[PDB]
Amino acid sequence: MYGLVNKAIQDMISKHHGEDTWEAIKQKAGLEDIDFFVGMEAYSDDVTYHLVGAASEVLGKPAEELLIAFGEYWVTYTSEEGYGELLASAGDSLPEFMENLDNLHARVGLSFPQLRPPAFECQHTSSKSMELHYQSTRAGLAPMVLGLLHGLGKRFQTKVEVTQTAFRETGEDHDIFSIKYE
Template structure:
């Protein structure tokens, strides 16, 4: 994954647990703590290693850490670093979720080695939908939950996110029911 992901994790962990904790994580994984360049791809194993080691060092359960990281990505990383792109992607939670693939297509113009997920929606009502998440990677289900919760906070709506079909339990891909309060 691009270094921006590792850097975002660094920001969140340093903010919430202190820079010394991040240094400890990097030492255990065997990298320098200021090592990552945003626009350079790194092996996925390194990102996964940073996540699991952060969980070990802080005692933060990895599922909760991934949810928190999803929220952080939307509310801090994307909001501060990609404001205009976030703004054109949608003016409501529903509109934004429908445009997630378009968002990553735009990101891929700047980062050509991006391997983005496929995220598509099936509308249920005016304030609920099924979100289909197809990925070449495993283990990021809770990250998606956090991303959707972060987006709901961005749009000031209360959201309920529920896993309806799970790849880890044999389904073809993850499907989430996303239900939010009408604005």
């Protein structure tokens, strides 16, 4: 993925557990060569998955748990490293936000013009709840979507209850979630 993402992980790790750690992880994930990530340059997803795996081992935490925290972080990190106005333009409620998210990523993608955004379709089951459809060219990131989702809860002082009901990894067509919100 574009190196913003890996910068993102490096800085979450760095803020939380120090630099020492980041570097072991960066070494473990087999990436010591690279001296910094280039925010607007593209990488092989490999780079991102190995980072996550290293992080797990060094930190002794489930990969899934790091994805979840990473999803939460990103929401704050984007609003702060040059995308806060774009974020805000995507709306000021969670449901509105989730409808604008493909357009959000579309705006982004005309700058990062090699972007492989995900797709998100909402089916509202009420004014407090929906089925969310997560469609992706990649595997493994559902847990990120949950962190992401709780992060947007914070941003909007909204309380979000989230549960996966369908699973790409098992060969189903895409990930689906049921979401209850304040």
